[PDB]
């Protein structure tokens, strides 16, 4: 299926993913496109932070859904 990832630049990229794909798996694809390491990625979906262990179907993320990429801070 198709999902959207609002990047840090402000642009929107498009990923082809499966419901069984883990959040980490998505972050890996984002890495190859944006050049951002999975460690420093925070994916947000409708106000919920996506924990690494889960999958897209777990968070009820279907086609045309929009994930938000937030940079991991260092305090």
């Amino acid at each position: 299926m198709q999902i959207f990832v609002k990047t840090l630049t402000g642009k929107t990229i498009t990923l082809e993913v499966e419901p069984s794909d883990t959040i980490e798996n998505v972050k890996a694809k984002i890495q190859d496109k944006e050049g951002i390491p999975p460690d420093q990625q925070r994916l947000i979906f409708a106000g919920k932070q996506l924990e690494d262990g889960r999958t897209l179907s777990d968070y009820n993320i279907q086609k045309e859904s929009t994930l938000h990429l937030v940079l991991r801070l260092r305090g």
Partner: protein, 318 residues
């Protein structure tokens, strides 16, 4: 030859005999005696009467008890937790201006933001026993276990700086409400139709992406499954408290007519390098800046806010 005990929960033990020809790692595995990694030494005498703490190569019954106690965890969760628990023993919780806080050490200012924010969340508990155990323990004056646990779950490394919001929401994802709260979203698409979505529990109290209640109630716009424009708007919301979180945003916080929120966290420095976290609350008519062991009580602040906590909610879309 010696004979020692082995546990992973501090309740169920098993008697194990190890030879003095091979180390713990090759005979038994990763173990912690008296809070120290002895998994590369040779069996001695003061441990030939007391107990150890296994981390890897568990039994079917220990793995069973692990899931009951720690929930589903990383294969390295046990090792990291033992290591962290020993490392954070030196940390201390002070009492800065009738509020407790984590004293600055080994880049733990982000952890101060998390804990001090957690302490302001009413009616919450944890599904995982060990977590809830360490939580109630924390409420009473010893917070060593709790700190080490949330660091273990958030994959925090000792001494390394980290994200406070990220850790806070990872923690809350393993928590639940000891009361009730509802959140009603009205989604609609000109083609597909109107659909109401209800959120109930702790999930109704947290939202990442906005920092003002007004923006939470504003009509949001995204893409429907058909490809067309889809909309969403909060039309009903009742919570004991509302936690809004977003990217560091520079707001002009002034106590002159103090805004709706009770507390907020602040990221100082530049977000591409290593910065600093400061927890802030609203007591009286002045701001209270809690800097991991300090209490600046000035009444004005131009800062980059991150997490913003609001009181109970009660809203209807007329």
């Amino acid at each position: 030859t010696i004979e020692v005990l082995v546990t992973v929960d501090g309740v169920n033990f098993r008697t194990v005999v190890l030879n003095n020809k091979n180390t713990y790692r090759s005979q038994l595995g990763c173990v912690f005696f008296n809070g120290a990694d002895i998994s590369d030494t040779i069996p001695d005498e003061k441990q030939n009467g007391h107990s150890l703490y296994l981390a890897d190569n568990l039994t079917a019954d220990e793995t069973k008890a692990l899931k009951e106690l720690y929930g589903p965890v990383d294969p390295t969760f046990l090792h990291r937790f033992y290591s962290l628990k020993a490392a954070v023993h030196g940390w201390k919780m002070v009492v800065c201006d009738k509020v407790r806080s984590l004293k600055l050490s080994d880049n733990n200012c982000y952890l101060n933001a998390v804990i001090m924010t957690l302490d302001l969340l009413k009616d919450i508990k944890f599904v995982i026993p060990a977590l809830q155990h360490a939580f109630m323990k924390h409420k009473g004056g010893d917070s060593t276990d709790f700190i080490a646990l949330i660091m273990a779950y958030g994959n925090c490394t000792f001494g390394a700086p980290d994200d406070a919001s990220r850790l806070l929401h990872t923690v809350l994802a393993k928590a639940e409400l000891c009361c009730s709260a509802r959140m009603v979203w009205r989604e609609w698409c000109n083609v597909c139709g109107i659909k109401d979505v209800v959120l109930q529990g702790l999930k109704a109290c947290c939202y990442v992406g906005v920092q003002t209640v007004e923006d939470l109630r504003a009509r949001m716009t995204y893409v429907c499954q058909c490809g067309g424009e889809r909309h969403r708007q909060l039309v009903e919301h009742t919570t004991p408290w509302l936690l809004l979180s977003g990217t560091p945003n520079e707001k002009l916080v002034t106590t002159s007519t103090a805004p709706d929120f009770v507390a907020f966290n602040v990221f100082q420095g530049i977000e591409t390098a290593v910065g600093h976290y400061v927890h802030a609350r609203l007591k009286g008519g002045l701001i209270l800046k809690f800097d991991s062991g300090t209490v600046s009580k000035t009444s004005d602040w131009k800062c980059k806010v991150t997490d913003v906590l609001f009181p109970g909610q009660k809203y209807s879309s007329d």
